[PDB]
Design a protein around this ligand. Structure first.
Ligand SMILES: O=C(O)c1cc(O)c(O)c(O)c1
Lengths: 266, 265
């Protein structure tokens, strides 16, 4: 409804239609191990081109930070706007044909989250927010869940590394373990932007993950904030975008989750 | 597609439309379980009415209703119904859950439906006919190893550090090779995703027969392999299952046997 948000939304829609046609072709004509990385890079960069063309047609002086393309500075007052783009969040899902992935676009004005779009092109779920305007899913206002504690909570999470990183891993599995008793479930769906959007819509009561990139978190974090939730890093501060670890939730479940993970950090 | 499978498919469609309207509306914690029991039993009634309109002599085993014997020749047919698989997702509004209907003839899996009513994805199979998603032939993935594999898994319980440790050990060993491990929260859809090539393999323990029956037939008919944790074919009875493409099934089975007690073997 704000012109900048509408621009971002149409760019996400075009990218998502491209991604949807790609998955359709994938599902009938089956790429093998070696080709998978190259197919993903191709679809990623085609969707990013779609988005960036649409954005720059309206705001050519803005700064752009894409997953495929890196950081490109803006000029004049446009230098105060930074687009943070994951054109395809959930690439492993995508390349396997798992229908759970999103386009993720955030706009920051002087370093504050200003606009956000997370678009599931399969389910056709459009999560939007502007700073101080609240959040919507396909036009309906979003609210975080009301659950009062982790008792029976449904959490989201993820471990995005798939390396040797035995320190991190153990710590994570310790966090995970402490959460297993109270919660009704933990889900590992494979796209952090959709996990944050689901926190915002009330579908998850909270979410925690480390090892993320800015483009994975930016839009979904604004969604959670504007839906009435809380978002921070693992230490409780607001440097999640920079550090790559994030806790998001409704008020009570955010607080309980943060407390629960404290013993498994220094 | 054979008339018995088409009957099962229409029953799943009606149940799924009911489930979809139910999700649309949703309410605090205490009432949640009663709402879910209501929707569960309404969907099961829908399914069972449709099935028995065609095969009144068949045996029926639903999650809500238990087992009812059949009669005559019909006693050799057993329908195994989960009317709503993935209730925690459902009650939270997470759009990942399915209706699961299997038909067994003399104890062997004969027909199968797994229906995602949100994404409108209809997984169908008959014994010796192969599997389809919305009418298109399904094949298990071609990946030759766990390198870059996407696996699926689940914990039905959370009462249990008896079980807990066991799983978390398995999990850890699998993290290096695979591209990802997923916990989506509906075993019937995890098996259907193995069948369609979306997961390269899947393992879970603590399941009920109605959770596994249809998806197991889907995997078999899509060219995959399905067994229990010991490698035998008593997954329906034991509640632990491994399914996958041929190589990733084999690798996953090998990987998890050393991390089990003799209890799950
Ligand atoms: O193995 C996992 O837990 C995992 C793997 C992923 O590729 C991923 O994006 C994620 O959020 C979780």
């Amino acid at each position: 409804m704000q012109p900048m948000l509408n621009i971002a939304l149409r760019a996400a829609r075009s990218a998502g239609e491209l991604i949807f046609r790609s998955i359709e072709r994938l599902d009938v004509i089956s790429v093998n191990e070696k080709d998978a990385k190259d197919y993903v890079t191709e679809v990623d960069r085609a969707a990013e081109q779609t988005i960036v063309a649409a954005l720059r047609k309206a705001y050519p002086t803005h700064a752009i930070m894409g997953e495929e393309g890196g950081l490109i500075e803006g000029s004049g007052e446009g230098a105060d706007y930074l687009w943070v783009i994951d054109p395809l969040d959930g690439t492993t899902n995508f390349i396997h044909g798992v229908p759970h992935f999103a386009v993720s676009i955030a706009c920051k004005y002087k370093g504050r989250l200003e606009h956000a779009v997370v678009l599931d092109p399969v389910r056709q779920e459009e999560f939007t927010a502007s700073r101080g305007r609240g959040a919507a899913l396909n036009g309906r206002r979003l609210r975080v869940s009301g659950r009062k504690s982790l008792e029976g909570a449904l959490l989201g999470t993820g471990f995005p590394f798939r390396d040797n990183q035995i320190d991190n891993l153990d710590n994570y599995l310790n966090m995970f373990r402490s959460l297993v008793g109270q919660t009704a479930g933990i889900r590992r769906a494979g796209a952090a932007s959709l996990d944050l959007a689901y926190v915002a819509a009330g579908r998850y009561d909270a979410f925690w993950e480390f090892g993320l990139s800015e483009w994975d978190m930016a839009a979904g974090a604004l969604l959670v904030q504007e839906a009435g939730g809380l978002v921070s890093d693992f230490t409780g501060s607001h440097e999640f975008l920079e550090k790559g670890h994030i806790v998001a939730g409704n008020t009570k479940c955010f607080k309980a989750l943060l407390t629960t993970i404290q013993p498994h950090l220094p």
